[model samples]
Target: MSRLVLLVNPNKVHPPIAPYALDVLTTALEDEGFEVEVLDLTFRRDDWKTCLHEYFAERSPMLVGVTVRNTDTVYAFEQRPFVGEHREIITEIRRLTDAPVVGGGIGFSTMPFALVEYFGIEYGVKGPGEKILCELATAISEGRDTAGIPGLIRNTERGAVRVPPAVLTVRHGKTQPAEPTGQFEPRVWQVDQLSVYRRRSGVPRKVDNLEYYRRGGLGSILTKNGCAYRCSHCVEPDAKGTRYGQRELASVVDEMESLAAQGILDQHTTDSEFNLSIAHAKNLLREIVRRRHADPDNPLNRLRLWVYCQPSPFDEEFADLLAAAGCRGVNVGSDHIRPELLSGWKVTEKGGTYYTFEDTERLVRLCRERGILTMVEALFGMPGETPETVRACVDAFMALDATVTGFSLGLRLFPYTPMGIEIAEQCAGVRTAPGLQSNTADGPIVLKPLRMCASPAEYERQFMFDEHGNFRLVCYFSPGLLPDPARAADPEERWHGAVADLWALIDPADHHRVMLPTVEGMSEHDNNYADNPFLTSLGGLGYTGAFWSHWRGREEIMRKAREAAAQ
Candidate 1:
């Protein structure tokens, strides 16, 4: 068996995340009879180059696969890209070995062509790379043609070309597997001692695992792959495809048990939306409940799970199952309350289910009654968003008994998403079809240029480029709610201030629990978990589980910090 090396290259440290992709990929690669060596570059942020050089000095692998978890910090206030970091690492790896470098991860999958071109790499994978990566490795090692690999990006002189995964077929009312699918149907891999972040003697000496856990680190587990919804501003369906492939329920619980034995009791779901399939959510929660009561001495009894869910497809039974299974918190994707905005986003309301303001209120009320902390994430600045709509959404959330209300002002756009395509058309001066227009009291809404550090360019209207003119991230902030019709000195701050004013309309009694999104370095009120000093401080004070659960008394903590700083 040839030795293959896999590198985990996400070094962001604010809330260090365990690389769940590598855990599944390693098992899949090993199952194919390959000797896999993992080089985790998370803890060695400053010396990753030295570590890479040292590792490749003595041994060379058949192929090198680099996992990039984030393309940038997705915080609206602080839009930072990791292109330079990834480029530098790949360049260094090229200097050290003759191995062919391939890139894939959640971030890489979002912008495969742009990243492959920017990083100057030959190949990249756009979707779940577990299945395709294994096949690519085998093809490369055995000197076979890599032309038909699904979701594979091959860079040529003409440019990058993608081979899309085979469309699944239905036979006699049963779905047949796609020929070259990137996503696997059953994730039977055990997330046990095979993972890099395992603990021995109550702590991991290899990395700062304990600190990562304390600062809201999660033993990340995915119950399914791809999303079935087609929301306007979303990129999951485009990037990972619209098909939903769920793992067996037994396999999911098996992972929790493994994490518990390894001293990882704080777990979080990595699925796009846990309750997208209502039956899957209810059944999984019920199984967890069953195990706890079936055996009081089970290690999973000490486990706490934080879940991400959509507002609809949720009911009283689901809430009861969550509480019974010992769920700590839930983050609901409550974009807005207005029907116009909801329809614009194409939010699914399948089988008599809806994500109305009433649905959001009922969900929040249920969680509160069950003693589960809740975070209602509200996205402002959509196309039809106006002062009235923003006020209505804020007022509705403030009336709820939820733990916290997060006000995110802009939607991060990806090129493959509906909003991204619409923005591209708008840049080219193309008129949208009738009935598709987003109108307000004044007129139809229009998107304006919003950048943090990068200067405006021709591509700026379509994509977010770094200061060096590299594609980074794309975002859409509508001009409907802006005070000024034209771009201001700082559009982000202008919009942030506008929404912050609307959020202030709520009662002063709920100020501490109302989190306003702010630029990363400028303020500590950011609802984003990336590079947040507030979360780091909370973790230092021994906070655990998801970051939202600790937002109850944030005002006092910030006040004390300011007082100490002034002294």
Candidate 2:
């Protein structure tokens, strides 16, 4: 009998996330009658070298699959790459065992070719790996050719030849034949032993780390896969495919029950957006509601969920369903309120831009009536972003009384996305772009974006480079907003062409209702959730649900603290 060992290598502990991909894949591999066990390195961040040595020395598995949850901490202000960390793990694993090392997960899927070459791994599965890994395992055990497997990248002496999945388009498919809808249902999450996750005690006890995450760090579930819409800055459509791969609705609730059974009652859907397929979202919500009402004693009834959503495909019915299903909050990515800007960002649905303030207003109103939290993330550094447009977006979200709006600057450019391609071309001097039209305090302004660079200097502050000084992750801050780098760099300066303009536009009184992306001396409710100290302390106090929910009273607390320091 062949054995498979799956490793979860994400070491981020600020807000710990249980490896959902490994949990799902565990069931898939086990179902095929293959013996499998997971070696989660999250808890062994500091001691992963020793941990891997002992684990692999004792048992040599047929294949070792390492799941990379994130390539980097995604915040532009505090961006740091994790690919090097992943490479280190794979390098160490090679010393312990001669087994073929395979990599997958969201981080690995984003740039499989780059990672495969970087990690120097034998095989990698891009996108969903449940089916792909199981098949690869069979082929390896039976001595069959693994070259023809869909979504598998076999690093050979020739080169990294990618076998694109049947469901992907030509861009991802790579001259391979394409299938209609190229979609397949993801396996149901049925982990019998949830103890490994529920009883994590690796971090410091003073923070109450385990309980903090259980009640707050929030586990993730995918009711479905892929997105129907495309946004320029988003990689979901390209990586996960544009078609929706729906999960079994009942299995989704079962997964929730499984988490709740392990004392994890807070979760958020990891789908591209909860309401991308409106009917599918509604049906699943109804199932959750029905289960809650039918089995009043079920552990799922205790579950509190937060979801990612867009402005469209939402209504009174959807909001009502969300509340009924114990959804505590919703994070709507309304990048901008202006339609032209929306079009520029490619935030569209059914071949048309569907975001409307009225729609957002209706959803906010509905959530408010039902006591559900709303957090709107508005992008400030898009192509046409001027102070006037930024103020317009802020003004719109500000009118809503009981909501937290995140005015986030800098669009993180993924190499696969349209925004990334455009910026990359701009860097290569292959593409010429025109200025976007907007109105300023002075009058009509033509907002021209700064030319993006493939490898910008440190002072440019545009790209997050690896230790090798090569950048895989990049950020685009519109020159229209911050035209001068020197002026923008000054922490004290406040003017028309800098981030300080945002500080000036939003009043101190409104800090409670608004949040800025991580910057110097900023208040609570920052858009960047990674390594947030306030949230860490709040979670230590046993606060649960969405991080934004606990920010209601923080503004007053911060103000009083500042005054006391002055005296």
Candidate 3:
């Protein structure tokens, strides 16, 4: 007889990638024989507070579960920690009712215990909470034993008790992809409505530009759960076990069809590693191709995918299959260029194959040949990584004929990871953000969440595009750390500075007779200020071809206005 409220709490991180995990929870919760309501806070960025208040005034609930999608923007240049936002939401909700508030989601899963304690909540659930959440809710309502639930992190005076990650052996039918059968439609909870969502500019982004996003926003699907590799820098292996759990092909097909029905044109596989199993990888691609072939005039044809895969199974066969499957982009976790570094991190290319940077280069070339957008994301600041080593990796990234080379400085350390242990040992007594003293450190695995053992420059994200070739260099700073923009005159060191160097390489201004735009006033805003600054800075422009023609004369006007206000 108790009411359960499932709330979507994706605060401001957008072009609105709907919380797919929440959908899984919604479906599972419905079958658990509980009256559930989903509150989607993504529709109107500004009216979310009003909406939340309205929900509480309308119904008194037994338990409220709020989803936290991301903790921050994750860019060194643009850092925004949103735990504070959720913290406030919890505080506000408490004032409404005596019912206990629970938090969980992809973002909350990362630091469930920390958040349980930090937010002072009764319960928190880690990864894959479908079964765990149902059990916890049932036990609470029935007044039964709540201990030993697979992934529940319960808050107690002694501290939170954490559970091992759930390894699902028995398949659940409701989890399978399909139209949700719940009595309460979650879509109705969206802040304003879909039409309102379609009107808001992604940046201001104004109530306009919603249609542009509706048609182009990246709709994603998680093809599988779990990771096969224990890459030092990755959280997947720890988050979901080391064994890869591939979703059934029919289930995946259902998801793609569902997304197509929703009018989404672009898709990305949210798999930890897409090609961990060669046969599985091929089968999915085959399904994608089959669906496309089945409907010559089908919307699935317009549905292009951006996939994340490791290096080994990325041979010509997979490349050809990906292209045939209508893959529009390919992102490789070619984290480092050197063999020793790869070995140090146990970074085996998937399919049990040992690979060299040449293999990485080959994959890039294949994507290039097929006109597929390519991105290689790398990280510097791992233990034993120095400027010379960083230059080598940067040079390798630059050498690749890929579309974009994203390099972030610092390896975000998570307790229990190999790198986390190594760093904790070396930097003795030098604490990280999370008070994390050990990799396998006892209860609650203390969080030193967002930093690595080292650091690069302030920020440098260079995106260069034109007919000759398109490439992006994203990092805290470039190869050579130059004088800070806060001090220097030459202005050759910041993220915008890196953009200038690349432009100097191509000389877009010389040929196009217009300026190239790299989002202005972005690095400073992080997430504390108005929406995604990159989109806000340049999104209003009449929308130039490919990259940029000029600043649209609005850049400095907005910049000075903000600068003037701060002064």
Q: Could you say which candidate leads in lDDT? A: 1
**Cα lDDT of model 2 overall?**
0.65
Go through the candidates in order and give the C-alpha RMSD of each one to the true structure: 6.5, 7.5, 12.0
Better of 1 and 2 by TM-score: 1
Please give the ranking of all candidate structures by TM-score, highest first, separated by commas: 1, 2, 3
Tell me the RMSD of model 1 versus the true structure: 6.5
Order of quality (lDDT): 1, 2, 3
By TM-score, how accurate is candidate 3?
A: 0.70
Candidate 2 has which clashing residue pairs, if any?
A: 167-182
Error of 2 at 319 (Å): 1.8
Candidate 1: what lDDT? 0.67
- Stretches of model 1 off by over 4 angstroms after superposition: 164-211, 349-353, 429-462, 466-473, 486-493, 499-503, 520-533, 555-567
For candidate 3, lDDT tens digit of each residue in 1-567? Answer: 563644545455555555556556655566668766666666656777787788889877677787877755544333335767777777777777777777877666555665676678888866656667777778767666667665566777766765433333334643322111110111111111111011112322122223434423466666666666667666556555455556677677666766665565566787777877668879988888888898887667777777887776688888998998878778787788766556657453252326678778888888888887777767655555555676677666766745655656533344435554454454443432222211112222222222431211000000111112221111122223333435744322244544443334332322222222233542232343466443454444333211221223345645754665577
Alpha-carbon deviation at 327 in model 3, angstroms: 0.7
Best by TM-score: 1
Instruction: State model 3's lDDT.
Output: 0.55
